[model samples]
Target chain A: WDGKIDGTGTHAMIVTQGVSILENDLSKNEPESVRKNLEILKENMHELQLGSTYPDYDKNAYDLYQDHFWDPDTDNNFSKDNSWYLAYSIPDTGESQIRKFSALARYEWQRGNYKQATFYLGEAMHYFGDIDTPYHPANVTAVDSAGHVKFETFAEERKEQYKINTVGCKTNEDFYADILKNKDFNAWSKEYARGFAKTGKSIYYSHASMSHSWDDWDYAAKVTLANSQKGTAGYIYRFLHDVSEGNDPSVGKNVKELVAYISTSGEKDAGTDDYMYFGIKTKDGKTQEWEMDNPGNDFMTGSKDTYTFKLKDENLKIDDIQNMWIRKRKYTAFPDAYKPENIKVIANGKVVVDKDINEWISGNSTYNIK
Target chain B: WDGKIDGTGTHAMIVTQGVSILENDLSKNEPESVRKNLEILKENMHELQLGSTYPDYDKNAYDLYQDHFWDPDTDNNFSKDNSWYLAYSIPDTGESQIRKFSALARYEWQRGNYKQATFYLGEAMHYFGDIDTPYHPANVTAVDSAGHVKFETFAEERKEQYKINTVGCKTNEDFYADILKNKDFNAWSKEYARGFAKTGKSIYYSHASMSHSWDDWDYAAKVTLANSQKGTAGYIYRFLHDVSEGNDPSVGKNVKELVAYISTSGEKDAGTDDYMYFGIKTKDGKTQEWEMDNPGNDFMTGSKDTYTFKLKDENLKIDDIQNMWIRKRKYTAFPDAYKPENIKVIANGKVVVDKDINEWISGNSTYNIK
Candidate 1:
């Protein structure tokens, strides 16, 4: 590991070597960081020598970067991390093309090229930090096929290639722990490299198949969790031993308490809750008024004409209006008759039934305002 | 008129001065036609005295030019005609920045600052041509606050500032002649300058105003005729005559010919021409139907409708439609039911009717296959 090429310092190490400004610095050996890194590399000479190695000719050059590889400070460079500056910084507008033109025309005096230059400088600074932090490119927000920090550039390119899969990756505790732990740098490298390999391969395979893989993943995961045995991987059973089962877990206790609070009397005659049920009443020999009532359920459902309800009072014990064992209280009887003005609408100064009873009058209902 | 700074020779021209082998000639007086003209100037001055009296103030030295001003055979350098070229040709893209960048980058390759230089060059070119013309700074198409291009340049500016009445300048004579006349040019400049002077401090007042007042006027005489106007200005009466009568000597004839022979009539009434209106009929009512059609007057109103047009039949007649009459045909028992759908719609699908009664079952009118 020649420090010069491998990046001896933090600032120089962050850049893509040979592809950008840092390329010349690699050959120059002008800074102490490069020389020191080269020295450190020389002390640990291996079969893969820097000067003699070529990627095409030496297989180890590629092998050195495979799924499991070592690093001097693994967590610092390649750990799972988040950016703090992005959360704090405000964007400058002078770098904007429209703003640049306005400034040049003296429309924005003093906010001239200097302001433009400053805006560009700050944006460039943000860009550098962003590229290294697994964040978006300066102009992009989502990941793309090449695994580069940039998004697919063209609008059509994005729609055709990188459609989002809302079902996300599973949480892998071992992989996460390795990123957080301040372990030996080489050990950390081995773990981090191994951890991402399978998931990365899965990502690659998904793209190749052009399948909407994540939706399938979510569907399968949900079904598997639902069908699995009580204590297996797909199951979601709580570890009740952590507290004490002997105390009797208060499962569904709140629902029971709520039901008890709303109900009246200790003894309920109905199947579940005390309510009312009703249907039309018919008599064999005497003329009877059409009506419905019950002491259990609130709804009347046997026939359209029947209405049902529960009686709150329990002590009106009489057989019929003609014969009764005991009757001191007068029972008031009533019927829905003489429709109110609200129900009887006036059209052309004439009364008409307003209820949805006759389809013929659907287009003719009218009511007075004041 | 003076030998102090000769505008009459190749040596006085930009193309001939300081041009190196590496220099590009895209715009800076190197366009082939302009270069040939410079050569012509050199040949014209062959018989005249050609020497500069003063170097620093050579072009601006009016005193040295006075004696030779009347003599056409003499080569005088201090010509004021450069103002016209500067106001016209210099504001072109092919002339300035493109030349600068192309020269520096050797026309084929550029990077970094050179890349930026090329872009700026292109923008500068657009800026000049777009900014200066019969209209400058604002587009001739954009016009003044009232959306009119009546009074040409400085004249319109005057009207805008002072809120004065303005008239659209007629270019109809030039439209007929296709040739420019000095008499016409002078009259146009005179009328334009007087009108503009009423409300604006225009460049016309600063540049050409003094020439009219100069009683010591040999210069105006030196300008002879270039071409004659072909048609009389009295032809302006034709437009008003046609508008009032709904026909002219030729315009109505032209419209009749355009609508008659060029179109092919059909049931749904699509056409040989690409533009047409279409409409559709739905479960609710007769909807306006349209497709692209040379639906004549029908095309003016509806682009398409569903409720108004029952069906598309290319055999729809144009004459019997309410908006159009047979070029000469008399009325019939059935003045064809004007199909609003048969009207060619210029705009596409905007109006929609909702059916809540049908929605109660399951579906909406519009269904997406995808």
Candidate 2:
């Protein structure tokens, strides 16, 4: 779909931190360091720590904590305690089929159906594991993005598009990547410092770098939209004038079809902040809209937040909307050729008993139900 | 604790055959023969074929099937296309403090507790792969009575005085012995046939000679009063005598006890025949009386067929009693100290509230609930 390098670089940054932590942990595997790191992690996590099922804090607050980006990695760390061992997680969908198939295969084997058993096992091991990542990734370096060096415009754009395309379809790839990164981070950071030191001086400080940067590139489109309307009364007036000139030669004056597009106001904001917020400012303001901070409580308010219908200010929130649409769809099916109806109850076409079955029946039938 | 060889030599005869099967599977590693034996087992089974649940079948049918003599090695012709895997089984209950201690050790190891894990793992592993014959076992052989061989006998016979004495507890040793005997029987017969084939002739074929012994030790206890009394009036008389002996002997022969005891003969009807067919006969003849068949049926007609409780009566007809019970238990649990009493409900102390509350309203208070 759309090629955009949003968070491809973010993944690499996280991985590098993990590598550094791994290197650190590999340096030392002493009991003292391990114990020290364990204590430090426990101390740092003191307020954040949750009980097995019932925590001391509000359950909903903990639930909100779980939904945050930090929670997954936090849980990964918490699961490492002496008591709880983490087995492979079963994803909510897709590869779940593979798991079920594997279980079925084992069941068949238990029943001595070796062929079917082996088939399922093979599918689980090979075919199921080899599913492609749905999203393509683009990894742009910080130096390249800041434009410090003479960058190849073509290559940069290509890289950006690739990453954006990659992530749109990758099911649970982010979760898998996160877990692997965290495991490595925990492992290495402790190693580098004399022992199992995962906290204080030894703790890997890199995991904090994980971020979702796709939203940033998407918002950048707003500037381009504002820039198109610059001149006289501003970009909005210039846009109206240019379009008006196309229809009337008198208004066009000394302008050709090509000249109609160029505007004198080269400023980005164009004096007024009219186009500053893209389509956010309506000609006649009425409804209050959602912003980043307070993601409004909407169940009873009848007000909507952003991300509804994927439209921002009635303009597509997504710049590369074509690719965005490809990621999701709503399907509706209609009845084929026939609908439920009631036919006449007839014996020899005499209308022996013609009654409305679809509507309420007033107790008159051979069918007596008590 | 006494090493009395009551039924010790019984297992010896079958051991030769059992060891042969063991040698074939383990020492010889005869996968073909193992597979063949398994195939025959699967084929010969009536309802419990491979991958089928056995517990859902009729109890009497299950019992009769278990009684069927199955020398898999000989009958199945251990050739190919089937396989068998050796595994261990948990042992039966036994009355011994050491046994209980061993059980506790196993449980802890299973819990993966420190050194206990290894300790229990070893103890369990020693007896993990044992197997046994599903048969009348002790009664069919020259062993001690069922009462003597069961751990419950200690508390059963001397209710007022006995503690936990596990002298006749079932153990891994008993399980292994049963397996060895069954295995030996099959193996010896197979070997004999092979040798006989080498001589170009065969003698009288009989797996029954080794297996045709069985006993329904519980057969006599369940006879309907109408039937049991007809056979031997002393049987019912003996039952009354036993109750008298159980309580204080001097005061036991009271009118209530006599009336209850005599009425214990319970509801009965001659099947299609003059004899009381399969029907429940109660002692005490009150609420908790024995049920003959599927409960709540016309006992007089004796036409109702299916029953949950069935005894082995092969000649038993449609008019005959298929099953019986000693008594229907009413109270499942004994009274405990913490039983709740109403402190807030009724105007009077003895007033009982019977209405099912659809709603509960609380006025202004510390805890308001509806």
Candidate 3:
């Protein structure tokens, strides 16, 4: 054996991050009546974050038991119907385990056992949380030689850097299908397999480090972590939307329309350089992606440029807008820094963000404006 | 999601068989004072069998976590020092997790918390026991298709069929290496990897089933189960001998010399076919292999063939010959029937096995006489 061992793992932290992302979106449309259930659900989600790590330390991997670790033969047409089955993942691997567990959670929740539902869902989510790291489905053993063991020791200190402050795109079925697909993954099987493999983050973050802005693994992790936040949010939303029948009172519907007015102060020579972006998050638990709107596509240096654009399906409101994210590309060699001097927004014809100021509208990696 | 699920698995049954095999040898030497300890260990072994099945249902396969499932790259020279490390399995995978746990068990025992020691060892043993089935290391996902899920349903009712009666060859270091080597497995990576991967039986038994006698899966499982008993005994012996400072009183040394006398009756037509075998189990936990002694070009039946085979290193004594096994090849189309007419054995110049009987001396597979 060896001298020292890790006391815990990363699934828990990522799970917490995932919860934050979902709760951020929930901040919108959640009323006093539903706050109690949301609080209870939050606790359940938190508990699920902890409990989900259980399988990591145990033998519940999808492919274990006698099914512990064999390849699916070419003739996998056989099937068994059960409450745990999910069509998304190919059966006979951990690729398929989570959906079954999620399926279990759904049944248990429906049958009126909150505790059991939580545990089962925790079990389900545990699989989800683990795969978020990209190290899981990569199939590396947790040993030091291959540096596989090092993967779990992510920048725990940098955990705060990855918080999901805004509700973003994707939900339930479509997003989960992506997870199984691993974000357009095609390295292994011919068809999609859900859970971590579907996220395709592992492909980007292998031998990963979540710190520093200059490396590929790091680069991959940032986006991967973001995706996990959104993906987990989608997963929970589906669970909620399915259970609650709808969430005009909680989850709310998609935004019909909105607008944003931006004013930027540019450097005398380099204001023309572009790759700037911003996204919107409201209390409704859905967010608009970056680079939502643009006009004329050009800004002269040493002066202010103002543009007003309508939000297209981006979730936000004058009263409901929770935060905004702004960033620009880092590597184009813009020696003279251009800053975002002021920001203003109109949601559904009402004003949401209207402020001015001196701040570095930072790089693609850092969400400086929030 | 559809259908019903299995109620249990095969590991517990195999663990019981392993215990039986060990106990059969111990029958010769165990004293009342040690019987208590033996019983305790037996309980530990039984519990471990159940517990070992735990990981099969969890996410804790060798390569989960970030290190959860990656293959060792060309640069595996890196290392870590932990109590759970085992040299047998390559690091970073489940292949290596067991040795570390076993290593954990050794340390825990020395510090003296039998309960904790039992648990850690159980954890260790769980890995060992699961891998014994050949399915665990094979990396199969337990699904209805590819038949991986069907692996766990091994003849639970036929579990009694696997009870190890007579002791056989192989022990401790030599035997365990065989397990990790998987009885000379060479399909995956070049070098040896411990745990289930080391047990090559999975290669012999894919999409396995254990009931039928004619199938390869069933055939491989028989030998695989036998090895598990010896391997587990060796594992326990190493633990006890290391912790207790030698178990000559328990795990006893190898035998010096022995002899056996076999006579058979045959029809006048033809009687020279022989795949006959016999083994001796002594009070100490060890057994001599089958076919210990053979003489004369043929075992010509219908005539008494007195054979004095000095057991080079078999384990037994006149008072300690716990059990003797007899068997012959089952499939040589020997339409003419032959029967073992009488038997006599001299272990260390003392008469031990002596009987006048009429029974079939059969098969390389079944031990018909014991």
Query: Best-fitting candidate, measured by lDDT?
Result: 3
State the lDDT of candidate 1 residue by residue for B1-370, as single tens digits.
Answer: 1112332311121111211110221134223533443233234332111221112122211111111101110011111111111111111111222122222222111223333322232222221111121211111232333222322332322221221111122333333222223222212322322232222223323332333333312221111000000011111121112222332122111110011101122324221122223223333332332222110222222222111121222223222122211111112442322222221111011101211111110111121111
**Tens-digit lDDT track for model 2 on B136-250?**
2213232232212221122123222211111111212221222223222223223322221211110001001121111111111111111111111111111112222231211
Q: Give lDDT tens digits, candidate 1, residues A248-335.
A: 1222121100000011112222111111211111122231221122222311111111111122222221121121010011122322
User: Model 3, B1-370: lDDT tens per residue?
Assistant: 0111221345555445555655555543434544455566675664555444444443223112111222222112322324212212222234334444554454455556565565555555544544445443325445443133434445343445544643432233233223333221111112323333333332332334332123434434444555455555545544544445421221333333334445565545334465555665666757655442222333565654433333433334355656676555644765434476776554322234557767553334444344
What CA RMSD would candidate 2 show? Answer: 36.9
Candidate 3 ranges with C-alpha deviation above 4 Å: A1-9, A27-36, A58-92, A110-113, A136-139, A144-148, A155-158, A170-214, A246-370, B1-370
The TM-score each candidate achieves on chain A is 0.16, 0.15, 0.44
Q: Among all windows of ten consecutive residues in candidate 3 chain A, which has the lowest summed lDDT?
A: A81-90
Estimated TM-score for each candidate:
0.14, 0.14, 0.28
Tell me the lDDT of model 2 at A196: 14
For residues A22-130, could you state the per-residue lDDT of candidate 3 as single tens digits?
5655544544443444455676764565455555443212112211222322112112111001111112224334544554455556556666666665555554544
> Per-model i-RMS in Å?
37.2, 36.4, 23.1
